[PDB]
Amino acid sequence: MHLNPAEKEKLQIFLASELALKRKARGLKLNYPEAVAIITSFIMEGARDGKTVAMLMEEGKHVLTRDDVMEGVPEMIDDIQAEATFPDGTKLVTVHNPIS
Amino acid sequence: MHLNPAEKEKLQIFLASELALKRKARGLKLNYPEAVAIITSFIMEGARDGKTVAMLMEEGKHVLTRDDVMEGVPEMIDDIQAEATFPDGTKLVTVHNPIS
Amino acid sequence: MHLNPAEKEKLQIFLASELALKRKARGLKLNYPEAVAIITSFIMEGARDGKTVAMLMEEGKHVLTRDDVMEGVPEMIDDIQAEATFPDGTKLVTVHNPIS
Amino acid sequence: NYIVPGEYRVAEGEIEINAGREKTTIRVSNTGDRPIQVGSHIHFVEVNKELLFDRAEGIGRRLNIPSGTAARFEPGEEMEVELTELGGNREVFGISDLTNGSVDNKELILQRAKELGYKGVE
Amino acid sequence: MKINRQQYAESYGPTVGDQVRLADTDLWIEVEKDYTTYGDEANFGGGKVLREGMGENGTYTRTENVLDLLLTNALILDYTGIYKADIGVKDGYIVGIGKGGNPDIMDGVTPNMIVGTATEVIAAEGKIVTAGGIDTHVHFINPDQVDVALANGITTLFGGGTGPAEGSKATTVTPGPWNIEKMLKSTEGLPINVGILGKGHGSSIAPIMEQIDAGAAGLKIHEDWGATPASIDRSLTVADEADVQVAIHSDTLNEAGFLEDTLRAINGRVIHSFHVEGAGGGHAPDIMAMAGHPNVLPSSTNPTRPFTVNTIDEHLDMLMVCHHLKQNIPEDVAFADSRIRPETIAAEDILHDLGIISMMSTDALAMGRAGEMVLRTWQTADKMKKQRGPLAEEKNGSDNFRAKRYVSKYTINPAIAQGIAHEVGSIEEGKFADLVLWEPKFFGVKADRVIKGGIIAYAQIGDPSASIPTPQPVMGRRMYGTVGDLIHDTNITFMSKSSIQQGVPAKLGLKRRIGTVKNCRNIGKKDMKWNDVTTDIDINPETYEVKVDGEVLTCEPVKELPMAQRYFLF
Amino acid sequence: MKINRQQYAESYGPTVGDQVRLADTDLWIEVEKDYTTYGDEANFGGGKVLREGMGENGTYTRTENVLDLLLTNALILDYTGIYKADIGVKDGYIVGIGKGGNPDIMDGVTPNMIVGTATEVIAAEGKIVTAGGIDTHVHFINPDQVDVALANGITTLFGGGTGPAEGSKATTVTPGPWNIEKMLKSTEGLPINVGILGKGHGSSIAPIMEQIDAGAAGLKIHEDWGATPASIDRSLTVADEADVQVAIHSDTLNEAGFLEDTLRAINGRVIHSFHVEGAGGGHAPDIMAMAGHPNVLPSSTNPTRPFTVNTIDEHLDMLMVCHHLKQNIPEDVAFADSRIRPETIAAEDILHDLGIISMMSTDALAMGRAGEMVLRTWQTADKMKKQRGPLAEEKNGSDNFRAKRYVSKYTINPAIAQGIAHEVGSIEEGKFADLVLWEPKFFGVKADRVIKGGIIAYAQIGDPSASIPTPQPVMGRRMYGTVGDLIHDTNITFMSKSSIQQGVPAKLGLKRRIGTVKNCRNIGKKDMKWNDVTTDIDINPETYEVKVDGEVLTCEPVKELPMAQRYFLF
Ligand SMILES: [Ag+]
Ligand SMILES: [Ag+]
Ligand SMILES: [Ag+]
Ligand SMILES: [Ag+]
Ligand code: NI
Ligand code: NI
Ligand code: NI
Ligand code: NI
Ligand SMILES: [O-]
Ligand SMILES: [O-]
């Protein structure tokens, strides 16, 4: 596979997102690291799909809403940042205030 | 996400449990680390759901039965211990003799 | 669970394979590390199922075809090697030219 | 009582910056074709040569703006800014090398400024 | 010109009279004073104030009043106060608390806090800064426990052990000269301060004393080695001579004496009482009465902290597992019931709130959680505010009094008890620069950055392959302070005066900073900051109810805690 | 007997006139010459040629012309050429490039390239071998960044920082004697070459100079510390005396001068211009005109490399995040628009292609990607071939001219600029054996094996529990070169002559190889291999269009790059 250090690390994010989605599917309000994991993995899979940075800046704001998460979580997350390989190389996506 | 060392480690348990459940779903009798992974992750997700220590001490004894696992596995597992964050903080759950 | 170093590492392969299969399920042509992950995990789960080395040498050549992967990927993969615990202990499987 | 983790409940009132120091309003013009942004704590007389203002009026002073903020001058832009007095020992070293000593040495600072073409020396 | 208080606090962190919520608890701390000069705040960045000729002095060499490191705009939370200041560090020590910058052009700059060419900047505006935690009940069982401790803001580990040997798995003991020497060498690679306790057991002086000469920094009396009158007495005689602390886990079984017998063997000498509530070990059922005496420095371990609906079920079973108890041996059942007691665990919450138990600690990997000393201190303070209200001493709706009482339990008081407060345990000038930055939203839960001897050792930081360090995954990671030889300069091995005088560090090739244990024998309860209360604690032998001043101490267990499920992935 | 060219290339790697595709780009390199004697190729394995009495000499002791290590059949890609040779290493240095084996029985063996009893063999047939990359814009923010760098073939990190302190998070600066000493000790544990830059700021000489004496290997002028005329001048005076390089990130805000003012303060002295395009920092909008001057050694950082459809959206937002810009402050919006410019980023692609920007570098963790210097160099070369065609200078359909121009940007030119090219930066005899093997399919994307001082430090290798090392999972891993004391012998700490003369390595107990920084003050643009072009660069203040020789430089952003989604898991 020739995994580099970032590839190894970022597998963890996907895993944490899978864990969080299962917790959401069974009706739990999500906590801070769960919410972050979900939106992060969304951004990285969006890049893998070939979406643009601009698209993911919009979409990332609608992945989770306040009724998906515990009290206070929306306000704890100022932004979520992730770098992933787009069709035009690594780029940084920042989703600002992802959860209102 | 601000993962601490235990958060990073315990993601592994969930992953091993997912792997084991797939192996069970396709009809395999489970081995020692598979069985342990399954019950462990059950306890940790039970805590995340807000069950009590007492509930998980009971339930953990019915997650797998001897016909789910290989010969000898029931006797290899004296107990399974896991710590997880309950609504009232980290607590230790021990499931004694989980598989008869 | 008593995970040894290889058990810990090889959980990563399964995880990468799950990630790759999701990407394939949503219609993406798979890349080099995705393709390798998928076939590798297939071999290791095949060993867990109790298939023989000979069976997996055949099957591994049909897990993915060129229309599943990006241009050039078939030619980048000369073989895929994996060691796993068969009913008769650890053995090495090499799948030669897995993707035509 | 919705809980925002780590939130502030700030007290009432306002914070006055640079309290008790003399303030001065001057007009300043960016005569250059590229933008100039000036920070709160640069000795005002030592700013970019192409800013035109009464250079004498920048001696011993800096912008009267919150610590760490800046005044921005677009190309061709003229506007008024307010200055406050430098504090401490009232000495400046380095920056554009116009002072390297007490800010009291007004003629020496102006003479250096004029020879190097800092605009607005009388 | 004026700035409104909201914008001010957003740009520079809060100022006098502003309050900040601790994580998601009900606890509020209030800025008591501020060392700044409004308008001359130091800050670092593009176009900011710490630039040459401006807030940074361009004239002075490092020796001339210039700092190695300035923490700008810190909100300090410390037994000495809750207030706003810049913190200056030089040669690995806190040299100035006050106002940093450049006296060329700024008013009010503390004379030795010049930002010069030699100065590194850490922005602390909007952060809370505390001393690193001092955990004095550590079992050295698994080296992975160190990052766990660092991630919850612990910077010093005092205890004992040789790894997962049964002796070490039950007791904070590194026994004898050779084990002590081996662990001193092992300590060379642990990125945290360390002090090692020898075995406080024997009936002759020499077998005990030789551990102190070998390099131990104190002793542990543990019932598993025979917490008898003789072991207690000899250890205390050794400690009074060597000037080191003795920790005790007393005879739970009452085999050779009851609590009054242990107190008689101690004979008024100074001693640190470990897990004084007793679930963690000690004379059944009344060990907690230790915490009333003037010669006892009392600590809790963390799993009883605070009292919750799962506590008793968890502890009964934890004890069964730990002790290998059998449910069909009535003596084991009687033992567990005499040891795990809601009456004493509920009272423990209140004794903490009253300043009668002076210290927290973990009991890491033997019967407590390496990364939850700080976490559970605040959870306790929060539960006590909910159930007992703001304390009498409070004012202006703030919880400052409780905050200082509680922050003292894991910073300054364990340092004092151990004889190491000249070096660590508080944010004061002249002490080692072990500092923890916390975002207020994460306060007490997950440290932002842990500074060890003036260099960051541990940080919550993101993708190392990214353009900036904030992208995911943000996780706790060892920093440059832990790498190479810098691990030696950023950490202290605490040792007895005699081992230092005898040249043990050179004998063993230790390259870490060597700290001297001292002034442990001439202190008492009165020396515990904000937690100095001595009183007659009565524990009813029949019902286990705890009385102080004629009044039963009880509270309810809570179903839910702050600093829990909002934060943790597992 | 004759072998067809296909089979020959499959067995021994390509030979004269054969071409090889670089990864999945359109770029082809052609073997320019070959040192072998056909039929006497060296190879190692069962029944192969490097065996005692045959291709391995059985007579000579190590001192007698025998190698420690032979790389057989390497395709070298280097500013000195693209050609086929064996590479011989001894005492950690490249001692012979040519033909290795046994003069007993082989023709054409280079006299000092005997394979003897002392010789280790690495098979390079079918691999491309380059010098290790030299990254001269490194922020030391997170130690995890080192493996990231190694995995993309970087072997030297020059820059500054003390970990994730704000000063270090913005600037490549290890400030003052104590921080510099601490990072020199930390460097003892980093498995990569390192050079440390001090703070290039002050208005007196001594506060700056003492950093050089303390062990700094150069200085960084950064606007965040006040890139004023005085700081610029004093740093350059210090550097001309100490013989070290100065890097500059100039005054973006034009606060104290415009570009012509910074040039006047530099006054014809030698200087390294960092992220010369300016998205990474510098006089708005015209900093890139620096790259036209004879005394400027110009580098780009990597995130603008090359110009793509996501670049501008990514950078506008990256700048907002990095600078904490607010969209409802018009000055912040004006600032971002004056700084992030498609006109200068598009021209940057072309200036690289024309040999006017001489160097790449990362800007690791501050505004650039630690593991993508090499990656993005080739992506740029590939985009330029697509949009501008093969360069005039090319012949035989190969891209050799562009390949040498581009490989120079991250190997030899940063070494020259830093004053360290006597030690590192190219595959030449007498230089340190920092070598990267690449499978051509992975070229520039993921290094196969990274050799540091003659020992493998890092490799893409598989299951350590397997019968052979190739089974999954194949991932980048530290090798024996990084372990134990060998980390000292395989890596260099570069330091100033004065700190070396003053005995700083012994003072601090540094055990790493010590390299001397020198010959940095008497070089210019003309000294940049294949990238030596000086010219009047005009940047229109109103439209930001870039002109050179009367001609506007522009190109389109691409939607897709090679060395991207075919390779990466995320
Ligand atoms: Ag026990
Ligand atoms: Ag126990
Ligand atoms: Ag920025
Ligand atoms: Ag930036
Ligand atoms: Ni105990
Ligand atoms: Ni203990
Ligand atoms: Ni820069
Ligand atoms: Ni930089
Ligand atoms: O204990
Ligand atoms: O930069």
UniProtKB/Swiss-Prot annotation, chain D:
Q: Where in the cell is it found?
A: Cytoplasm
Query: Keyword Phosphoprotein on this protein?
Result: no
Q: Which GO terms describe its biological process?
A: urea catabolic process
**Cellular component GO terms held in the UniProt record:** urease complex
**What pathway, per the record?**
Nitrogen metabolism; urea degradation; CO(2) and NH(3) from urea (urease route): step 1/1
Q: Output the InterPro entries linked to this UniProt entry.
A: Urease_beta-like, Urease_betasu_sf, Urease_subunit
Q: What class of enzyme is it?
A: hydrolase
Reactions this protein catalyses: urea + 2 H2O + H(+) = hydrogencarbonate + 2 NH4(+)
Name listed for the protein in its UniProt record? Urease subunit beta
Tell me the organism: Sporosarcina pasteurii
Curated annotation (Swiss-Prot), chains E, F:
Give me any GO biological process, just one.
urea catabolic process
Which pathway does the database say it acts in?
Nitrogen metabolism; urea degradation; CO(2) and NH(3) from urea (urease route): step 1/1
List of residues binding substrate? H139, A170, H222, H249, A366
- How is this protein's activity controlled? Inhibited by fluoride.
What is annotated as the active site? H323
Q: Which positions carry N6-carboxylysine?
A: K220
EC number(s) per entry: 3.5.1.5
The chain positions of domain Urease read 132-570
Annotated Ni(2+) 1 binding sites: H137, H139, K220, D363
Give the UniProt subcellular location, in the record's own words: Cytoplasm
Q: How is the cofactor bound?
A: Binds 2 nickel ions per subunit.
Keyword set for this entry? Cytoplasm, Hydrolase, Metal-binding, Nickel
Question: Any idea which GO molecular function terms this record carries?
Answer: nickel cation binding; urease activity
| Record's comment on post-translational modification | Carboxylation allows a single lysine to coordinate two nickel ions.
What's the catalysed reaction?
urea + 2 H2O + H(+) = hydrogencarbonate + 2 NH4(+)
Q: Does this UniProt record's set of keywords contain Thylakoid? A: no
Name what cofactor the protein needs. Answer: Ni cation
Instruction: Give the CC-aspect GO terms.
Output: cytoplasm
The record, for InterPro entries, names: Amidohydro-rel (IPR006680), Metal-dep_hydrolase_composite (IPR011059), Metal_Hydrolase (IPR032466), Urease_alpha_N_dom (IPR011612), Urease_alpha_subunit (IPR050112), Urease_AS (IPR017950), Urease_asu (IPR005848), Urease_asu_c (IPR017951)
Q: Which family does it belong to?
A: Belongs to the metallo-dependent hydrolases superfamily. Urease alpha subunit family.
Subunit composition? Heterotrimer of UreA (gamma), UreB (beta) and UreC (alpha) subunits. Three heterotrimers associate to form the active enzyme.
Report what the protein is called.
Urease subunit alpha
Q: Which gene encodes it?
A: ureC
